[PDB]
Scaffold this active site. Structure first.
Site, PDB file in Angstrom:
ATOM      1  CE  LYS A 292      -7.828  10.337  -4.401  1.00  0.00           C
ATOM      2  NZ  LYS A 292      -8.875  11.398  -4.398  1.00  0.00           N
TER       3      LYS A 292
ATOM      4  CG  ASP B 227     -18.137  14.832  -2.929  1.00  0.00           C
ATOM      5  OD1 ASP B 227     -18.868  14.503  -1.971  1.00  0.00           O
ATOM      6  OD2 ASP B 227     -17.297  14.065  -3.445  1.00  0.00           O
TER       7      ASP B 227
ATOM      8  CB  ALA C 242      -3.000  18.035   3.869  1.00  0.00           C
TER       9      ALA C 242
HETATM   10 CL1  LIG Z   1      -4.514  14.078  -1.100  1.00  0.00          CL
HETATM   11  C1  LIG Z   1      -3.724  14.248   0.345  1.00  0.00           C
HETATM   12  C2  LIG Z   1      -2.659  15.097   0.654  1.00  0.00           C
HETATM   13  N1  LIG Z   1      -2.269  14.938   1.976  1.00  0.00           N
HETATM   14  C3  LIG Z   1      -3.088  13.983   2.513  1.00  0.00           C
HETATM   15  C4  LIG Z   1      -3.215  13.343   3.848  1.00  0.00           C
HETATM   16  N2  LIG Z   1      -2.364  13.648   5.036  1.00  0.00           N
HETATM   17  C5  LIG Z   1      -2.155  13.080   6.409  1.00  0.00           C
HETATM   18  C6  LIG Z   1      -1.112  13.498   7.304  1.00  0.00           C
HETATM   19  C7  LIG Z   1      -0.902  12.982   8.602  1.00  0.00           C
HETATM   20  C8  LIG Z   1      -1.701  11.970   9.202  1.00  0.00           C
HETATM   21  N3  LIG Z   1      -1.506  11.419  10.529  1.00  0.00           N
HETATM   22  C9  LIG Z   1      -2.264  10.214  10.958  1.00  0.00           C
HETATM   23  C10 LIG Z   1      -2.070   9.799  12.456  1.00  0.00           C
HETATM   24  O1  LIG Z   1      -1.591  10.858  13.222  1.00  0.00           O
HETATM   25  C11 LIG Z   1      -0.308  11.212  12.804  1.00  0.00           C
HETATM   26  C12 LIG Z   1      -0.227  11.546  11.274  1.00  0.00           C
HETATM   27  C13 LIG Z   1      -2.720  11.557   8.327  1.00  0.00           C
HETATM   28  C14 LIG Z   1      -2.928  12.079   7.028  1.00  0.00           C
HETATM   29  N4  LIG Z   1      -4.178  12.413   3.985  1.00  0.00           N
HETATM   30  C15 LIG Z   1      -5.075  11.987   2.959  1.00  0.00           C
HETATM   31  C16 LIG Z   1      -6.153  10.923   3.195  1.00  0.00           C
HETATM   32  C17 LIG Z   1      -6.692  10.671   4.473  1.00  0.00           C
HETATM   33  C18 LIG Z   1      -7.660   9.689   4.722  1.00  0.00           C
HETATM   34  C19 LIG Z   1      -8.127   8.910   3.667  1.00  0.00           C
HETATM   35  N5  LIG Z   1      -7.644   9.103   2.417  1.00  0.00           N
HETATM   36  C20 LIG Z   1      -6.703  10.061   2.215  1.00  0.00           C
HETATM   37  C21 LIG Z   1      -5.000  12.557   1.706  1.00  0.00           C
HETATM   38  N6  LIG Z   1      -4.015  13.531   1.505  1.00  0.00           N
END
Ligand SMILES: Clc1cnc2c(Nc3ccc(N4CCOCC4)cc3)nc(-c3cccnc3)cn12
Length: 246
Positions: free
Chosen positions: A36, A123, A80
């Site tokens: 982050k 939250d 994640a």
């Molecule tokens: Cl902290 C943290 C740890 N892991 C994550 C993660 N993982 C994640 C994996 C895969 C996909 N896909 C998108 C399309 O489809 C295929 C893959 C999106 C997010 N997202 C966010 C996040 C998401 C949205 C806005 N601000 C942050 C924060 N995270």
């Protein structure tokens, strides 16, 4: 401990407040994680780092460490694979009772733990819920987390300044359960002031497709008086829950 020299940065996972969250790998270990990036909430952050780092639960996002520079500050977070519940919700519109009851369970358990260490999230919303490899729910973002006792997810006692306890998360748990089944928060309005009034009066209704079992649990969680709301234990032990969870 850490520093940017230790990481190979990847694609952006999503945009946030102070900055973005990037996929990243630790050169030496090749370990996969999220990073982050953030450029006067600085205080609530020292509590975020402090709170989360010591919190260890399968349904809670882990904070491995941090580090900063002349410009921004980096939070080394557990990655994640399946993104946010928010995205899965926009993609599916609504969840079925099976899926919802599961998230509720995983969430309740993580909250039960949280409350033992005397921590309250305050939250809890889809944007702050993530999904592990097995698609399990993981709570993140403790920026608004306190250790002591949009409005859409805030209980009446909070929007009205009153002192609050671990009961707030059960109000949020009701709001969430409702949004999983319906596609939108119970008190969703077009303006801040309207939403405020609807939360204050606790004005919500059910679409016909919301089963009697689900209506009950939700109606039990959304009581203006914190004292009336069930406790996490009772939540797991709800007929509609145990009949749909896993
Ligand atoms: Cl902290 C943290 C740890 N892991 C994550 C993660 N993982 C994640 C994996 C895969 C996909 N896909 C998108 C399309 O489809 C295929 C893959 C999106 C997010 N997202 C966010 C996040 C998401 C949205 C806005 N601000 C942050 C924060 N995270």
């Amino acid at each position: 401990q850490w520093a940017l020299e230790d990481f190979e940065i990847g694609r952006p996972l999503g945009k946030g407040k102070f900055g973005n969250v990037y996929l990243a790998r630790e050169k030496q270990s090749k370990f996969i994680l999220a990073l982050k990036v953030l450029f006067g909430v600085e205080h609530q952050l020292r509590r975020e780092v402090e709170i989360q780092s010591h919190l260890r639960h399968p349904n809670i996002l882990r904070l491995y460490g941090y580090f900063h520079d002349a410009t921004r500050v980096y939070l080394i977070l557990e990655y994640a694979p399946l993104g946010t519940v928010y995205r899965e919700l926009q993609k599916l519109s609504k969840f079925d009772e099976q899926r919802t009851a599961t998230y509720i369970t995983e969430l309740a358990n993580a909250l039960s733990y949280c409350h033992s260490k005397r921590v309250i999230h305050r939250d809890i919303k889809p944007e702050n819920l993530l999904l592990g490899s097995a698609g399990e729910l993981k709570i993140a973002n403790f920026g608004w987390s306190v250790h002591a006792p949009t409005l859409d997810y805030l209980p009446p006692e909070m929007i009205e300044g009153r002192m609050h306890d671990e009961k707030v998360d059960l109000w949020s748990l009701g709001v969430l359960c409702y949004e999983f089944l319906v596609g939108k928060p119970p008190f969703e309005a077009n303006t801040y002031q309207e939403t405020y009034k609807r939360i204050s009066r606790v004005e919500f209704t059910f679409p016909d497709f919301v089963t009697e079992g689900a209506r009950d649990l939700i109606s039990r969680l959304l009581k203006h008086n914190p004292s009336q709301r069930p406790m996490l234990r009772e939540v797991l032990e709800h007929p509609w829950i145990t009949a749909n969870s896993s």
